[PDB]
CSV table of C-alpha atoms in Angstrom, one decimal:
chain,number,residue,atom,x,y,z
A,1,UNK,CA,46.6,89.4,16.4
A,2,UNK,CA,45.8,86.2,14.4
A,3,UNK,CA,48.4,84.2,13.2
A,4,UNK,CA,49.3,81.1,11.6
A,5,UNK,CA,52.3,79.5,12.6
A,6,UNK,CA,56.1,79.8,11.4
A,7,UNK,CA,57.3,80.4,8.3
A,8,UNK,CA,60.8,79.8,6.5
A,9,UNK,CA,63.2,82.7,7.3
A,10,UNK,CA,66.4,84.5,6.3
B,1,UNK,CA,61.1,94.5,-6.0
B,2,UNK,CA,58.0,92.5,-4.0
B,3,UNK,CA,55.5,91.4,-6.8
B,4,UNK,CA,52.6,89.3,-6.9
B,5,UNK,CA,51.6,87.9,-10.2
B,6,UNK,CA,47.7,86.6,-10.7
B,7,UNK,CA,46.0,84.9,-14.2
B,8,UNK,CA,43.8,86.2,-16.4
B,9,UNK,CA,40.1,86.7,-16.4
B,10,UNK,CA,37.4,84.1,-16.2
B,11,UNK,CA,34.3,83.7,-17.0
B,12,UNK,CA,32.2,80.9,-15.4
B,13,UNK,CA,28.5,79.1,-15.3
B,14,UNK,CA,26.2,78.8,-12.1
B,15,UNK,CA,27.6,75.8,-10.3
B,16,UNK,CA,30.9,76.3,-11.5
B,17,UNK,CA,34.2,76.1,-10.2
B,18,UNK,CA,37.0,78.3,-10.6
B,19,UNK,CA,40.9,78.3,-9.3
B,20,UNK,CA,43.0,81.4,-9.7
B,21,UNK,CA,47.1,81.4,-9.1
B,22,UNK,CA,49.2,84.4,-7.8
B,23,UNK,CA,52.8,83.9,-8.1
B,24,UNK,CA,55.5,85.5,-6.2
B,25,UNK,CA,58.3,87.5,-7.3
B,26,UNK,CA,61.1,89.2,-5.9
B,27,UNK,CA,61.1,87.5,-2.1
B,28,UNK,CA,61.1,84.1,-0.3
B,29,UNK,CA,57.4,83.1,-1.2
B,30,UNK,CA,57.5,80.8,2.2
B,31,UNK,CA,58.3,83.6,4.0
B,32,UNK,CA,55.0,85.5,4.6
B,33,UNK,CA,51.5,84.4,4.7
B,34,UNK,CA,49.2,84.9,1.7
B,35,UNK,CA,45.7,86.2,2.1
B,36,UNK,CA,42.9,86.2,-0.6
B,37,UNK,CA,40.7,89.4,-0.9
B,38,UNK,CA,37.7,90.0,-3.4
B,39,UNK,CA,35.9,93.3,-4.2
B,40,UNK,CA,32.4,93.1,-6.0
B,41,UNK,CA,31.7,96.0,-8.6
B,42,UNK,CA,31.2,99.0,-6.9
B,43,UNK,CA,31.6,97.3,-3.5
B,44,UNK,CA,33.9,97.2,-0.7
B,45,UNK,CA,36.7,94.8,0.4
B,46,UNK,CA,35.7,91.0,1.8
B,47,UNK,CA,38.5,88.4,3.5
B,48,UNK,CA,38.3,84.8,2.4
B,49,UNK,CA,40.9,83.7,3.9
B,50,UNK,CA,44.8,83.2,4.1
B,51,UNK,CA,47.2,80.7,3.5
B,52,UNK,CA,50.9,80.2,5.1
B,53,UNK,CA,52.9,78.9,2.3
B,54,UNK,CA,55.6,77.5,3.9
B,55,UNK,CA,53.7,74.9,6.0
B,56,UNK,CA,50.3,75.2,3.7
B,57,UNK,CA,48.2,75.6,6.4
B,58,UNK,CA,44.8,78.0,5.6
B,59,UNK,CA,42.5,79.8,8.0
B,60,UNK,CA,39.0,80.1,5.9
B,61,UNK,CA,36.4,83.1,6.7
B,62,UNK,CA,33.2,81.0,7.9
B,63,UNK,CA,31.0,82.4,5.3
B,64,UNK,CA,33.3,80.6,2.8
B,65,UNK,CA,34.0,76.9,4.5
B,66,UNK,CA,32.9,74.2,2.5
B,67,UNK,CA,33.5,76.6,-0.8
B,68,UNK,CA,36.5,77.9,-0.7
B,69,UNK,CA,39.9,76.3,-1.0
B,70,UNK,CA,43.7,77.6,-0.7
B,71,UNK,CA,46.6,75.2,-1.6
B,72,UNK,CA,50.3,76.3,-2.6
B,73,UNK,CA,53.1,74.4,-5.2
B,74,UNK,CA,56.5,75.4,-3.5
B,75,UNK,CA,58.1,74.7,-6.9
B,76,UNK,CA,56.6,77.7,-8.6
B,77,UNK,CA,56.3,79.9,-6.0
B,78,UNK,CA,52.1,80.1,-7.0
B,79,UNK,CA,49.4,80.2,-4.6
B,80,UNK,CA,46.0,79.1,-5.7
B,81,UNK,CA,42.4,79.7,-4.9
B,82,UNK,CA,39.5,77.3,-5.7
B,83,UNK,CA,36.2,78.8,-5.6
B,84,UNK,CA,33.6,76.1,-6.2
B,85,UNK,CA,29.8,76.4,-6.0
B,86,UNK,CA,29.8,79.5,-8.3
B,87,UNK,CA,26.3,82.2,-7.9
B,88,UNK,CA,26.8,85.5,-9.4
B,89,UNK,CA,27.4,86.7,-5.9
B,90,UNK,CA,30.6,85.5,-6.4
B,91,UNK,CA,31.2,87.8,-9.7
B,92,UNK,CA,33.9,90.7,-8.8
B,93,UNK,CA,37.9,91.0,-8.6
B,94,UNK,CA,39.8,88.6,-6.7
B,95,UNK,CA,43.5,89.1,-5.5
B,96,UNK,CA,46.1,88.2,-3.6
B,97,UNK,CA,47.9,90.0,-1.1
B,98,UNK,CA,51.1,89.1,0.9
B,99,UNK,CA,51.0,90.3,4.7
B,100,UNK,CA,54.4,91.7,6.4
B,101,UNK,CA,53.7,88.8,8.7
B,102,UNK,CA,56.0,90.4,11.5
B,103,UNK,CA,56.1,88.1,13.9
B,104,UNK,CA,54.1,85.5,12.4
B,105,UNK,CA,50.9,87.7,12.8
B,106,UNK,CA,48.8,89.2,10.8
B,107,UNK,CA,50.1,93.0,10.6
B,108,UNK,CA,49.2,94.4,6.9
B,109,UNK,CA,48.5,93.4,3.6
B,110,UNK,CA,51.6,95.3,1.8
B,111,UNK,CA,51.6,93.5,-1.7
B,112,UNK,CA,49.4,93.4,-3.7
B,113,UNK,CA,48.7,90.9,-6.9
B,114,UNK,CA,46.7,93.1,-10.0
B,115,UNK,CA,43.6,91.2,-9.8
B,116,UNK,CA,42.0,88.6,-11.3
B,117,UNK,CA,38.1,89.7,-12.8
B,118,UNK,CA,35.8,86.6,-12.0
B,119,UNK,CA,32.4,86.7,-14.5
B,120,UNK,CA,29.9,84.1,-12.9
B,121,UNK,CA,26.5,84.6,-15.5
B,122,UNK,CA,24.4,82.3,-17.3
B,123,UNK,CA,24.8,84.6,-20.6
B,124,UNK,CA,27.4,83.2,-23.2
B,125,UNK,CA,30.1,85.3,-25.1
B,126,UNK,CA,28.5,88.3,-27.6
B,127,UNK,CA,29.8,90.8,-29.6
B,128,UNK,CA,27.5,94.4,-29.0
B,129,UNK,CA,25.7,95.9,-31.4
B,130,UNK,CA,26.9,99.8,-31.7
B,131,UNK,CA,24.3,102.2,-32.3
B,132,UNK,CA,24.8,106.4,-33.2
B,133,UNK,CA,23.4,108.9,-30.7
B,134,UNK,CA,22.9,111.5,-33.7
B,135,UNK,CA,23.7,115.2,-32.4
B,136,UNK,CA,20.2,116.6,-32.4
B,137,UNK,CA,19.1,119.2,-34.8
B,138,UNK,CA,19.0,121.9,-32.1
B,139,UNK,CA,22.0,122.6,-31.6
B,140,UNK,CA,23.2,125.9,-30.7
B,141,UNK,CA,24.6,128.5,-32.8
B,142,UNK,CA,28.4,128.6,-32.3
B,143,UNK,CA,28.3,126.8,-28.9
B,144,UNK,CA,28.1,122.9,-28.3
B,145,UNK,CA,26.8,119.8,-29.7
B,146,UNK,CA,26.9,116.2,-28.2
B,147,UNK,CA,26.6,113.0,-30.0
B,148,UNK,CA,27.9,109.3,-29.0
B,149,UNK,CA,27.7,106.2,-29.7
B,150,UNK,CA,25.4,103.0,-27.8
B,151,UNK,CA,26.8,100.0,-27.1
B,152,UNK,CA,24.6,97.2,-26.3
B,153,UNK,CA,24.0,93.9,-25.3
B,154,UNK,CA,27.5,92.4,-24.6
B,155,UNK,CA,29.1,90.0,-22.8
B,156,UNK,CA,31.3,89.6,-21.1
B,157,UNK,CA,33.7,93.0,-19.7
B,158,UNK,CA,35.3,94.5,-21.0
B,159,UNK,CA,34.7,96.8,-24.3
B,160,UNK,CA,37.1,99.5,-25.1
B,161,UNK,CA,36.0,102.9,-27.2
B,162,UNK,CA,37.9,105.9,-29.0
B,163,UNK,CA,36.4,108.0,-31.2
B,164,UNK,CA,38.3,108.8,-34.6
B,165,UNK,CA,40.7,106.4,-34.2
B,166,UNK,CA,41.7,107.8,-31.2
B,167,UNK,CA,42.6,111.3,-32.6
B,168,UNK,CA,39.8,113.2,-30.2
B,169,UNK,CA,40.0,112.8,-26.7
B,170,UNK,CA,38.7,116.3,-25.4
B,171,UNK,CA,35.5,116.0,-24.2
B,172,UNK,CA,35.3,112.4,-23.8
B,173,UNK,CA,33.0,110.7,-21.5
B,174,UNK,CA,32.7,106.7,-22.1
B,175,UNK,CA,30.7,105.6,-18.9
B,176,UNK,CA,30.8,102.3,-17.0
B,177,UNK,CA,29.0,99.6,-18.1
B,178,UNK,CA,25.6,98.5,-16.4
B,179,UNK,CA,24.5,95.3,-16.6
B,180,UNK,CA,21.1,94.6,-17.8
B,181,UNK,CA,17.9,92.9,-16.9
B,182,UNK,CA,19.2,90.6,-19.8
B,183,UNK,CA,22.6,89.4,-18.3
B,184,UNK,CA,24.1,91.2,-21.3
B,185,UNK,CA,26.0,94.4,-20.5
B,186,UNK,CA,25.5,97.8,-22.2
B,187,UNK,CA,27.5,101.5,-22.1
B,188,UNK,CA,27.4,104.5,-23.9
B,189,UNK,CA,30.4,106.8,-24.9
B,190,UNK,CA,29.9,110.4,-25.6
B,191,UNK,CA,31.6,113.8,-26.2
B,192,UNK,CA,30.9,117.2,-26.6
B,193,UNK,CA,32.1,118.9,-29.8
B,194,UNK,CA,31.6,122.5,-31.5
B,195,UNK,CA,28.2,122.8,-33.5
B,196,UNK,CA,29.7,124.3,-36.3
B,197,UNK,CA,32.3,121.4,-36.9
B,198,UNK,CA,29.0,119.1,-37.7
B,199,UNK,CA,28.8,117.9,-41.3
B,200,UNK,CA,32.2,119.3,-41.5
B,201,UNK,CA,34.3,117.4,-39.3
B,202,UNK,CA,33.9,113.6,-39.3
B,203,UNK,CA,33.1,111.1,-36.0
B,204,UNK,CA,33.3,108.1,-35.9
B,205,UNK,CA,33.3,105.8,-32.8
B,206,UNK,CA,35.4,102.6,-32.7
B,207,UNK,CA,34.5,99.7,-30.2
B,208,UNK,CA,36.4,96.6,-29.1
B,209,UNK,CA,35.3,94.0,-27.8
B,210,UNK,CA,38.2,91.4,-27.3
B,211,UNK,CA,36.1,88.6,-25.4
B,212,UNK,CA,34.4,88.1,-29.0
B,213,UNK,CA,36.5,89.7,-31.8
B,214,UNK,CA,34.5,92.6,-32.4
B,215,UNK,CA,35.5,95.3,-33.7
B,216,UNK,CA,32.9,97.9,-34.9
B,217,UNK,CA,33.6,101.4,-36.6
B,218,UNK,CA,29.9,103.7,-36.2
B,219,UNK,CA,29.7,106.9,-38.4
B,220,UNK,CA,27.8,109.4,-36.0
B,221,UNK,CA,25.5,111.8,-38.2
B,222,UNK,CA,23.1,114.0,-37.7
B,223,UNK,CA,20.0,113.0,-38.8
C,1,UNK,CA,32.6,89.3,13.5
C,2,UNK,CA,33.6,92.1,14.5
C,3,UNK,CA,32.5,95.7,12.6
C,4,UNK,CA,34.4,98.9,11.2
C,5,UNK,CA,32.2,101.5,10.7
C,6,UNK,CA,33.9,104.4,9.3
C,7,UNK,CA,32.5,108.1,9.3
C,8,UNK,CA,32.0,109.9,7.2
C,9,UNK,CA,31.2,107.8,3.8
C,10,UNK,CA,32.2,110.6,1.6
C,11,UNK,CA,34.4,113.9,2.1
C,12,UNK,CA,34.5,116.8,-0.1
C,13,UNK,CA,37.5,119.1,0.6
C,14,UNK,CA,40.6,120.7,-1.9
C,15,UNK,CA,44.2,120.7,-2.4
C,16,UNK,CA,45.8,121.7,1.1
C,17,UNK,CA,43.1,120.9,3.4
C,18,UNK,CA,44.0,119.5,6.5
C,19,UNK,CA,41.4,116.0,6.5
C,20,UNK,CA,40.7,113.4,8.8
C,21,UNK,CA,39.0,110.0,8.6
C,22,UNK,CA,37.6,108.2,11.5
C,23,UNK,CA,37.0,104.2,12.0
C,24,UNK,CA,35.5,103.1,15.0
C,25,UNK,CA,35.4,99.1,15.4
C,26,UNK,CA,32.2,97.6,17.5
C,27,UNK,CA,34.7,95.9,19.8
C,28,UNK,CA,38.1,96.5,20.9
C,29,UNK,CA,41.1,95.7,18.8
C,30,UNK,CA,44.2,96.9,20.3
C,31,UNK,CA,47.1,98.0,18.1
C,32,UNK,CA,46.1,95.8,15.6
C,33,UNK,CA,44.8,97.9,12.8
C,34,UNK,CA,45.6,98.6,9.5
C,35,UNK,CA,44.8,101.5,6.7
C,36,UNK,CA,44.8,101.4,2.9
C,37,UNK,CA,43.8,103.7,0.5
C,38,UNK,CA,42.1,102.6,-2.9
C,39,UNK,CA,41.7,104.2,-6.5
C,40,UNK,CA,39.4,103.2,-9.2
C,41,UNK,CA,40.5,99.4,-10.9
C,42,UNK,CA,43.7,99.9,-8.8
C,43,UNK,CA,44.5,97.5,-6.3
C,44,UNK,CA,44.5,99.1,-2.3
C,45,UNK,CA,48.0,100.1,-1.0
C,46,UNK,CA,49.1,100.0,2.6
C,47,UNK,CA,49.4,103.3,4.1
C,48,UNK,CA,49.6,102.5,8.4
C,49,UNK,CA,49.8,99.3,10.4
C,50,UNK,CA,50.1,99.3,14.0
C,51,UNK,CA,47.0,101.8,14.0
C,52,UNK,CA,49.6,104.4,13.8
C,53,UNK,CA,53.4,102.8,11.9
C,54,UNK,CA,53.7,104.2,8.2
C,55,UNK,CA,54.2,101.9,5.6
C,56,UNK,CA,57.9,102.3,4.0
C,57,UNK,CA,57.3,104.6,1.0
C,58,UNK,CA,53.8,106.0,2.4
C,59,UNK,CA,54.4,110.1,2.2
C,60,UNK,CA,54.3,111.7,5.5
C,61,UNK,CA,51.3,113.5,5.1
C,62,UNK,CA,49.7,110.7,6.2
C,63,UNK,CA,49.2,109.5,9.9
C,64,UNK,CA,47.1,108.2,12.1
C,65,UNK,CA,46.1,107.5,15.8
C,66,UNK,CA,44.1,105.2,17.7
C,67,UNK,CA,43.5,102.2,19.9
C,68,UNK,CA,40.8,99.7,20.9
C,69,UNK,CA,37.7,101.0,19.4
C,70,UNK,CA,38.1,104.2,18.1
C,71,UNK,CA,40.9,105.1,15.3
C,72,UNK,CA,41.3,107.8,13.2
C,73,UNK,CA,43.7,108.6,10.1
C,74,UNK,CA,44.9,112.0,9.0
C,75,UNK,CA,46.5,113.7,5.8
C,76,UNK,CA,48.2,116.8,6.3
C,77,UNK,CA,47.9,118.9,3.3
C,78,UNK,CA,46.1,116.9,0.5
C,79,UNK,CA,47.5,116.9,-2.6
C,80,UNK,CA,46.1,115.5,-6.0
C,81,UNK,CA,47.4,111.9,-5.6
C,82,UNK,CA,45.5,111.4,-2.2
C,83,UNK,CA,42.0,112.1,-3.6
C,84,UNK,CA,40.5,108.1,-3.3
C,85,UNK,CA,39.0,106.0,-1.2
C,86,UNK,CA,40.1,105.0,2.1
C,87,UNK,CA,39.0,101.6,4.3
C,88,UNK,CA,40.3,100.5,7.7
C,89,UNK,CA,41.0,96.6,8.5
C,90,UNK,CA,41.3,95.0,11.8
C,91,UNK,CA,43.7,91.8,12.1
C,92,UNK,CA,42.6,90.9,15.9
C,93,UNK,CA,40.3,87.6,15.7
C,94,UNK,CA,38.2,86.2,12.6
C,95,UNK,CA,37.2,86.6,10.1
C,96,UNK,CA,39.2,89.7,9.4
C,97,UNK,CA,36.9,92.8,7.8
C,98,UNK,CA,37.7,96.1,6.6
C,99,UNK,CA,35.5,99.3,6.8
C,100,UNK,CA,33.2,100.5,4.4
C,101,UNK,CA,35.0,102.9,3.1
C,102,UNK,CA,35.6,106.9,2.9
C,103,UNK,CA,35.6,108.6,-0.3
C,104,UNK,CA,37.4,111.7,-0.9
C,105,UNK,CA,36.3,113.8,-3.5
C,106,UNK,CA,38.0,117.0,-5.2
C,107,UNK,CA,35.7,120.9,-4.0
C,108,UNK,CA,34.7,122.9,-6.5
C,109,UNK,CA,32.3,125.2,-7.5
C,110,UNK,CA,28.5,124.3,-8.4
C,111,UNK,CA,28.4,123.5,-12.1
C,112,UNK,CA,24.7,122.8,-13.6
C,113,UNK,CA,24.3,119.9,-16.3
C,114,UNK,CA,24.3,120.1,-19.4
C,115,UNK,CA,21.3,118.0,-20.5
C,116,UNK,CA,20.9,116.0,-24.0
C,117,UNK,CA,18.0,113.7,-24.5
C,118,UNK,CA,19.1,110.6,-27.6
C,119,UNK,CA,15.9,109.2,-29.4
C,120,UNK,CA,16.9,105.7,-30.1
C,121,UNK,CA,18.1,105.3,-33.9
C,122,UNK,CA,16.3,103.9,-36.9
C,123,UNK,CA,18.7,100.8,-36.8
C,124,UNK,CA,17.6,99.7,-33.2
C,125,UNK,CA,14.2,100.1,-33.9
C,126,UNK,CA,14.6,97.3,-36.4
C,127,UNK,CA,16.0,95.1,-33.5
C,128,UNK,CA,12.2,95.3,-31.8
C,129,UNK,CA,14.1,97.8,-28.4
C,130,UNK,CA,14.0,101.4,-28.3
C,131,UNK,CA,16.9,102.4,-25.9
C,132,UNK,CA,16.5,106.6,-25.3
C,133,UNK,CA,19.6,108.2,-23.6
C,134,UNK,CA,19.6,111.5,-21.8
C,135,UNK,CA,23.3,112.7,-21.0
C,136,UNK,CA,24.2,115.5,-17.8
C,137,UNK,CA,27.3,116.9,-18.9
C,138,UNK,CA,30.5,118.1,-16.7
C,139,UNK,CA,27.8,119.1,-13.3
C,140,UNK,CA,28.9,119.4,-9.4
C,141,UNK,CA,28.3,118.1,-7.2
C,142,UNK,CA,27.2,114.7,-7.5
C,143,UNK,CA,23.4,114.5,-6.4
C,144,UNK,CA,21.0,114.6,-9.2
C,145,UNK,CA,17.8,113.1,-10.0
C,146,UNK,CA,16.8,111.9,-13.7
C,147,UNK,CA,13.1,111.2,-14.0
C,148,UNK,CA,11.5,110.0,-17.5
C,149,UNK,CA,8.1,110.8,-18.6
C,150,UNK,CA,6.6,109.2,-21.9
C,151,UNK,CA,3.2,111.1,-22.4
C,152,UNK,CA,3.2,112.8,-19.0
C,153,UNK,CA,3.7,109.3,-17.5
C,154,UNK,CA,6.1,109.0,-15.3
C,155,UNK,CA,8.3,106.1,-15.9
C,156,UNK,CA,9.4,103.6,-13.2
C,157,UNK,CA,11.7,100.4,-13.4
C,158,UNK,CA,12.8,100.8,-17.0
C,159,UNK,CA,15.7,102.8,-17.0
C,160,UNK,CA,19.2,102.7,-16.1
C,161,UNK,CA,22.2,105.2,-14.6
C,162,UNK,CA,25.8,105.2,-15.0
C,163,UNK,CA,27.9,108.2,-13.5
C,164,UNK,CA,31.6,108.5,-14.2
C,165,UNK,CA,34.4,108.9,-12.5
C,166,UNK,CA,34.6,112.6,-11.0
C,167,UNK,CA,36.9,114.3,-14.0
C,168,UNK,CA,40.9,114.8,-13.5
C,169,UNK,CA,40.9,118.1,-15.4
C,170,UNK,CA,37.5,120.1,-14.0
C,171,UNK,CA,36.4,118.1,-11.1
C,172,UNK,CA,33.1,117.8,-12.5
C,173,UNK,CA,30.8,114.3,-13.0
C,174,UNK,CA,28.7,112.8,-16.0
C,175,UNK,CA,26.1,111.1,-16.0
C,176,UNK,CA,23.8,109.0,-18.4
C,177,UNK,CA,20.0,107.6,-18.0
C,178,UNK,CA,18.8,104.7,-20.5
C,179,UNK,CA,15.4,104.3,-21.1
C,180,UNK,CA,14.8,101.1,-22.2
C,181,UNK,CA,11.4,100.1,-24.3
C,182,UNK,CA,9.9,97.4,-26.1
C,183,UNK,CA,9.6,98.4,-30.0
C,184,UNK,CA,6.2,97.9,-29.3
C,185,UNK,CA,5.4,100.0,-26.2
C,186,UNK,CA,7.4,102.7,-27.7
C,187,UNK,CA,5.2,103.0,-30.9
C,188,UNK,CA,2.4,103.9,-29.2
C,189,UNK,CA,3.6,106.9,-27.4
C,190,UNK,CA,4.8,110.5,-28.5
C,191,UNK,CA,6.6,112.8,-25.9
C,192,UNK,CA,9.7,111.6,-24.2
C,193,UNK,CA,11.3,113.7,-21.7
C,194,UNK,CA,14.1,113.3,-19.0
C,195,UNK,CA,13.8,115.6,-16.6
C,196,UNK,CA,16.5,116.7,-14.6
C,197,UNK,CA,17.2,118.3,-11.1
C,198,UNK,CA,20.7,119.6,-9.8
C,199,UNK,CA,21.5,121.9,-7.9
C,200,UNK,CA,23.1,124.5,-10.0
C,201,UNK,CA,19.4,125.3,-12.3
C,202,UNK,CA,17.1,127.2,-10.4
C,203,UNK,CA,14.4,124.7,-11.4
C,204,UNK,CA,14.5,121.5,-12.6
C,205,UNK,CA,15.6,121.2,-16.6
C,206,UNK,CA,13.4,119.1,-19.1
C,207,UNK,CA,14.8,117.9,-22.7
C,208,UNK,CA,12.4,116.1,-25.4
C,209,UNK,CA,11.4,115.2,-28.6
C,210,UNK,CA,8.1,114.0,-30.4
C,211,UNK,CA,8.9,110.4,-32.0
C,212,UNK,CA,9.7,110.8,-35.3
């Protein structure tokens, strides 16, 4: 699927 | 305990421009991407984009490049949308949704902000003009009667209506607003009482119309 | 882009029925499907992702199947809470689109209209507009035609319908028809009628009045 990159986790 | 929070209604001019925020609650805002979603009255759903807020970068739906625009402030946890270039094609509810992002891939939009209504009309703000539908003078022995009340030529959404103060609510029917040739909006509000409470019992009809500080109280009689 | 058509548009069933949706995408989308169901000036809730994962929280009634092109979604036993709208949505390339939508609607029996016909007040008429309402009252199902005749002249472009929600209590709809008129234009006529077909009268229902 589409998708835009990482984002912050935890 | 996932919440999105959007601002209130607008109301804006051909040409216009219009930015809405939706702030999150209850997660790490930079932790999923945002998308924007819009529904026109008595339409379906349409995509304009989303938006990852940790890095800020957007993915646009072609049929709104050049028009559309998605930025995010960290330090509020708010996403925004700018809508610019305003027609009244662009009139409907606009919200935000988070998606569970598994992956860092679109997945499914699982939160969902209330809404934001978006009014794109030439017409300025006007209070309606409430009119009696008078139960006619045939109505039936011992069976039903149905009177109402107009409400016509406002603008913008929404009105709300009771009838006696909000003591009779059986029978009720207040029905979506059309809008009009005109630009201005109009509905009607009805209900079905006995025929023999007529002359004895009284109705009276009371509209609200926030947007302009209306409020009307109508006396429905038969003529 | 790529299209979700989903069949069929509307669905009448009742409590307990056993119901399924279909949506069937014009090109192939994998897994990556999602469904959400919708009620009036509510916003749409995630019920399956994964063309076939429930949501947390989503009842088990629900599921749902499928894979490419052709996905469907099923609810076991509907029960009051699931009668709404239903739309598909692909995530696989852009933009990202959703179906058209399936509305499910409560059965009941057939329930003729009521009909009222509303000449327009005395206060209007000083506003130079004649606005003349004709009310259908608690019918099922849905279809009905409203057509107005002003002298036996049958009246095109100058009216307006708004139907209501269908009702929690009885299941049945409402609907009104607005005849809008110059003050002018209705001076010069007498007889105003809406007449009304539905499938519950054995032949189609007229309401009128002589102005004045």
């Amino acid at each position: 699927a589409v998708g835009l990159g990482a984002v912050f986790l935890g | 305990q996932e919440v999105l929070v959007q601002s209130g209604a607008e109301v804006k001019k051909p040409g216009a421009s219009v930015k809405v925020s939706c702030r999150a609650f209850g997660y790490t805002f930079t932790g999923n991407a945002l998308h924007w979603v819009r529904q026109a009255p008595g339409q379906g759903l349409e995509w304009l984009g989303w938006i990852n807020p940790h890095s800020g970068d957007t993915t646009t739906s072609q049929k709104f490049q050049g028009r559309v625009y998605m930025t995010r402030d960290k330090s509020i946890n708010t996403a925004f949308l700018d809508v610019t270039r305003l027609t009244s094609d662009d009139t409907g509810i606009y919200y935000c949704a988070r998606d569970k992002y598994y992956g860092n891939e679109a997945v499914g939009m699982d939160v969902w902000g209330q809404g934001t209504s978006v009014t794109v009309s030439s017409a300025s703000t006007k209070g309606p003009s409430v009119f009696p539908l008078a139960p006619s003078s045939k109505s039936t022995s011992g069976g039903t009667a149905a009177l109402g009340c107009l409400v016509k030529d406002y603008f913008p959404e929404p009105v709300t209506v009771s009838w006696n103060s909000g003591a009779l609510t059986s029978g009720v029917h207040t029905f979506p607003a059309v809008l009009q040739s005109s630009g201005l909006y109009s509905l009607s509000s009805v209900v079905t009482v006995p025929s023999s409470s007529l002359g004895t019992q009284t109705y009276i009809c009371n509209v609200n119309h926030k947007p302009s500080n209306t409020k009307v109280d109508k006396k429905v009689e038969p003529k | 882009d790529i299209q979700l058509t989903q069949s069929p548009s509307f669905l009448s069933a009742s409590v307990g029925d056993k119901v399924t949706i279909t949506c069937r995408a014009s090109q192939g989308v994998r897994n990556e499907l999602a469904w959400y169901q919708q009620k009036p000036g509510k916003a749409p809730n995630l019920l399956i992702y994964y063309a076939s994962t429930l949501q947390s929280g989503v009842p088990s009634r629900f599921s749902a199947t499928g894979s490419g092109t052709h996905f469907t979604l099923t609810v076991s036993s509907l029960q009051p809470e699931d009668f709404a709208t239903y739309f598909c949505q692909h995530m696989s390339s852009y933009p990202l689109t959703f179906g058209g939508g399936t509305k499910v609607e409560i059965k009941r029996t057939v329930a003729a209209p009521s009909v009222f016909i509303f000449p327009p007040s005395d206060e209007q008429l000083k506003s130079g507009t004649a606005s003349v309402v004709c009310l259908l009252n608690n019918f099922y199902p849905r279809e009905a035609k409203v057509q107005w005749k002003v002298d036996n002249a049958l009246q095109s472009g100058n009216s307006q319908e708004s139907v209501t929600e269908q009702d929690s209590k009885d299941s049945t709809y409402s609907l009104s028809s607005t005849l809008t008129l110059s003050k002018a234009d209705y001076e010069k006529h007498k007889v105003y009628a809406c007449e009304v077909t539905h499938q519950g009268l054995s032949s189609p229902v007229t309401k009128s009045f002589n102005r004045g």
